[PDB]
Design a protein around this ligand. Structure first.
Ligand SMILES: [Hg+2]
Length: 72
């Protein structure tokens, strides 16, 4: 499914992911696509900071959802 990642620069990146994917993989996808080191990625959804060991499904993130990316 497709999801959006809104960065603080005003750029929104599109990503193809599965609800079963882990947050660490999502960060991996972002680094692969935008080159942002995973260690600097702070993802937020619904006011919650996402944890590397959890999955998108754990947070109820569905298609067309928008995550927020703040660089650490
Ligand atoms: Hg938002």
């Amino acid at each position: 499914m497709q999801i959006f990642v809104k960065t603080l620069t005003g750029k929104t990146i599109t990503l193809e992911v599965e609800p079963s994917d882990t947050i660490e993989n999502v960060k991996a996808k972002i680094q692969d696509k935008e080159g942002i080191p995973p260690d600097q990625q702070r993802l937020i959804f619904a006011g919650k900071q996402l944890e590397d060991g959890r999955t998108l499904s754990d947070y109820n993130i569905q298609k067309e959802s928008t995550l927020h990316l703040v660089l650490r």
